[PDB]
Design an enzyme around this catalytic site. Structure first.
Site, PDB file in Angstrom:
ATOM      1  N   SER A   1       0.830  -1.194   0.000  1.00 57.81           N
ATOM      2  CA  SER A   1       0.000   0.000   0.000  1.00 57.81           C
ATOM      3  C   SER A   1       0.870   1.252   0.000  1.00 57.81           C
ATOM      4  O   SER A   1       1.882   1.325  -0.696  1.00 57.81           O
ATOM      5  CB  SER A   1      -0.933   0.006   1.212  1.00 57.81           C
ATOM      6  OG  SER A   1      -1.935   0.999   1.080  1.00 57.81           O
TER       7      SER A   1
ATOM      8  N   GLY B   1     -15.479 -13.109  -1.759  1.00 63.99           N
ATOM      9  CA  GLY B   1     -14.255 -13.324  -1.035  1.00 63.99           C
ATOM     10  C   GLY B   1     -13.551 -12.091  -0.532  1.00 63.99           C
ATOM     11  O   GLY B   1     -12.761 -12.183   0.368  1.00 63.99           O
TER      12      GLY B   1
ATOM     13  N   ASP C   1      -8.892  -3.107  -5.955  1.00 70.73           N
ATOM     14  CA  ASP C   1      -8.630  -4.162  -5.014  1.00 70.73           C
ATOM     15  C   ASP C   1      -9.395  -3.994  -3.717  1.00 70.73           C
ATOM     16  O   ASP C   1      -9.071  -4.599  -2.769  1.00 70.73           O
ATOM     17  CB  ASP C   1      -7.139  -4.292  -4.751  1.00 70.73           C
ATOM     18  CG  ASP C   1      -6.615  -3.276  -3.773  1.00 70.73           C
ATOM     19  OD1 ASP C   1      -7.260  -2.314  -3.445  1.00 70.73           O
ATOM     20  OD2 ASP C   1      -5.518  -3.474  -3.331  1.00 70.73           O
TER      21      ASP C   1
ATOM     22  N   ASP D   1      -7.314  -9.237  -2.900  1.00 72.70           N
ATOM     23  CA  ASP D   1      -7.678  -7.920  -2.456  1.00 72.70           C
ATOM     24  C   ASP D   1      -6.568  -7.232  -1.637  1.00 72.70           C
ATOM     25  O   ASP D   1      -5.584  -7.839  -1.336  1.00 72.70           O
ATOM     26  CB  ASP D   1      -9.059  -7.902  -1.798  1.00 72.70           C
ATOM     27  CG  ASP D   1      -9.057  -8.321  -0.355  1.00 72.70           C
ATOM     28  OD1 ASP D   1      -8.108  -8.170   0.360  1.00 72.70           O
ATOM     29  OD2 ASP D   1     -10.051  -8.854   0.043  1.00 72.70           O
ATOM     30  N   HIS D   2      -6.784  -5.974  -1.306  1.00 72.84           N
ATOM     31  CA  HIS D   2      -5.826  -5.178  -0.543  1.00 72.84           C
ATOM     32  C   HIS D   2      -5.333  -5.818   0.755  1.00 72.84           C
ATOM     33  O   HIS D   2      -4.167  -5.666   1.118  1.00 72.84           O
ATOM     34  CB  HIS D   2      -6.408  -3.793  -0.247  1.00 72.84           C
ATOM     35  CG  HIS D   2      -5.370  -2.737  -0.024  1.00 72.84           C
ATOM     36  ND1 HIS D   2      -4.636  -2.185  -1.052  1.00 72.84           N
ATOM     37  CD2 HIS D   2      -4.943  -2.132   1.109  1.00 72.84           C
ATOM     38  CE1 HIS D   2      -3.802  -1.285  -0.561  1.00 72.84           C
ATOM     39  NE2 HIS D   2      -3.968  -1.234   0.748  1.00 72.84           N
TER      40      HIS D   2
ATOM     41  N   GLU E   1      -6.040  -9.328   1.668  1.00 71.58           N
ATOM     42  CA  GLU E   1      -5.651 -10.721   1.462  1.00 71.58           C
ATOM     43  C   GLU E   1      -4.163 -10.847   1.109  1.00 71.58           C
ATOM     44  O   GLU E   1      -3.510 -11.836   1.465  1.00 71.58           O
ATOM     45  CB  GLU E   1      -6.480 -11.383   0.349  1.00 71.58           C
ATOM     46  CG  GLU E   1      -7.989 -11.453   0.585  1.00 71.58           C
ATOM     47  CD  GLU E   1      -8.717 -12.071  -0.610  1.00 71.58           C
ATOM     48  OE1 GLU E   1      -8.169 -12.017  -1.733  1.00 71.58           O
ATOM     49  OE2 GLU E   1      -9.813 -12.631  -0.428  1.00 71.58           O
TER      50      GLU E   1
ATOM     51  N   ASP F   1      -6.686 -10.555   5.546  1.00 72.62           N
ATOM     52  CA  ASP F   1      -7.966 -11.119   5.164  1.00 72.62           C
ATOM     53  C   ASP F   1      -7.650 -12.456   4.557  1.00 72.62           C
ATOM     54  O   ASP F   1      -6.769 -12.571   3.761  1.00 72.62           O
ATOM     55  CB  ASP F   1      -8.730 -10.239   4.196  1.00 72.62           C
ATOM     56  CG  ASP F   1     -10.149 -10.696   3.966  1.00 72.62           C
ATOM     57  OD1 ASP F   1     -11.000 -10.483   4.798  1.00 72.62           O
ATOM     58  OD2 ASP F   1     -10.443 -11.214   2.921  1.00 72.62           O
ATOM     59  N   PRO F   2      -8.339 -13.482   5.003  1.00 69.52           N
ATOM     60  CA  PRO F   2      -8.128 -14.840   4.496  1.00 69.52           C
ATOM     61  C   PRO F   2      -8.471 -15.044   3.027  1.00 69.52           C
ATOM     62  O   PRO F   2      -9.280 -14.331   2.512  1.00 69.52           O
ATOM     63  CB  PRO F   2      -9.068 -15.667   5.358  1.00 69.52           C
ATOM     64  CG  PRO F   2     -10.079 -14.709   5.810  1.00 69.52           C
ATOM     65  CD  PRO F   2      -9.326 -13.476   6.076  1.00 69.52           C
TER      66      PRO F   2
END
Ligand SMILES: [Ca+2]
EC number: 3.1.1.3
Length: 392
Positions: free
Chosen positions: A111, A284, A315, A355-356, A358, A363-364
């Site tokens: 990020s 997800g 994302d 994603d940002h 995961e 995040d799983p």
């Protein structure tokens, strides 16, 4: 094969904390484990930086420098006077004194950390003309960080970085949702935001601004105060640097060093809608992002600000189009990966379906082989040659 022995340094974004914070729930690994430990166990010496999550990239760079070499954070006399914050901050023991001895490092950043890394490299190399001149005109001392001539960074890797900012900051209720995002992260590490915890837990490192959570104050209340503070209201903030104009501005001066390798990784967890042209969050995606952030990112257009259809894929937090490297107000070059890692340019390593959160394990995502991702990365950085040669 291994060509360099440089240690890996991990760097977070607008969210992040030290290894001893969040009761040990790691920013780098989250629910999936400990990324730094994984690399170490596999033979890649790895360290972790923790800097002010809400702070400007400039403050973060100053903190990073000092955390690396040891010493007291020196934000620069000109800079501190320009924004009304303290000139000196925390003192660090220093993670890598070897840097002062000719050593180098690889920076892996996620990020906003990507912006910070770029800035760090720039300051290291070129220093600050403004700080140098202020020092001379006022007879104040000057941090070596502002002299230039430092060569500590062999490479910089950015993951889901908003090099050209994120449109998320254009949301009308950005201020509240942003802090709710912090609350969600706290929720991910099993920490409540309505409890006045006596232990630190999440230190935002606001020494320069004289801010800190007080006894009896929960994160909810603390965030309410932060929202009205300079770390949220000034131009010397993450908030500003995260914006499309704020990013472009940073890009106007933060350039790729022709002495460093740069790798970029993009992320996306969206799908396009056939009738609207908008982007929607995939199954997800972290719940907070899917409900609060994604719908906006995948539908916000702004012609005057240059935000068009290429900016919608995201994302959950950052527009994918912004990650491959700085473009707005930038002179940096971006080159699509062709099996060869070029120096002093952005090597666009592609887009990953994660994603940002995961991507760092916060995040799983069972279909994302996180351990292998980072191990592959480490091996690739380790194969970088400290000086390539010109061949046919
Ligand atoms: Ca997920």
């Amino acid at each position: 094969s291994r060509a360099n022995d440089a240690p890996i340094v991990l760097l977070h974004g607008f969210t992040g904390w030290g290894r001893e914070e969040m009761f040990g729930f790691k920013y780098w690994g989250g629910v999936r484990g400990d990324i730094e430990q994984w690399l170490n166990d596999n033979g890649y010496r790895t360290y972790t930086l923790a800097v002010g999550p809400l702070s400007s990239n400039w403050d973060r760079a100053c903190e990073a420098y000092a955390q690396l070499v040891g010493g007291t954070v020196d934000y620069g006399a000109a800079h501190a006077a320009k924004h009304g914050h303290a000139r000196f901050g925390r003192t660090y023991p220093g993670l890598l004194p070897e840097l002062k001895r000719g050593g180098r490092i690889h920076i892996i950043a996620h990020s906003q950390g990507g912006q910070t890394a770029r800035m760090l490299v720039s300051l290291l190399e070129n220093g600050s003309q403004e700080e140098r001149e202020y020092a001379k005109a006022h007879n104040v001392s000057l941090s070596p960080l502002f002299e230039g001539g430092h060569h500590f960074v062999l490479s910089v890797t950015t993951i889901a970085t908003p090099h050209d900012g994120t449109t998320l900051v254009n949301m009308v209720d950005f201020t509240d949702r942003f802090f709710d995002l912090q609350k969600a992260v706290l929720k991910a590490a099993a920490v409540a935001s309505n409890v006045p915890y006596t232990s630190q837990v999440y230190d935002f490192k606001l020494d320069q601004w004289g801010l800190r959570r007080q006894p009896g104050e929960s994160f909810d209340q603390y965030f309410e105060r932060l929202k009205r503070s300079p770390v949220w209201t000034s131009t010397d903030t993450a908030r500003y640097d995260l914006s499309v104009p704020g990013a472009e501005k940073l890009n106007q001066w933060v350039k790729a060093s022709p002495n460093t390798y740069y790798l970029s990784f993009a992320t996306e967890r969206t799908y396009r809608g056939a009738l609207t042209g908008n982007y929607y969050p995939e199954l997800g995606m972290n719940a907070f992002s899917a409900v609060v952030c994604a719908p906006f990112l995948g539908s916000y257009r702004n012609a005057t600000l240059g935000i068009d259809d290429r900016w919608l894929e995201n994302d959950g937090i950052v527009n994918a189009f912004s990650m491959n490297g700085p473009k707005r107000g930038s002179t940096d070059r971006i080159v699509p990966y062709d099996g060869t890692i070029k120096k002093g340019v952005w090597n666009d390593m592609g887009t990953y379906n994660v994603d940002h959160f995961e991507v760092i394990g916060v995040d799983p995502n069972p279909l994302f082989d996180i351990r292998a991702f980072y191990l592959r990365l480490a091996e690739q950085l380790a194969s970088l040659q400290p000086h390539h040669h010109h061949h046919h």
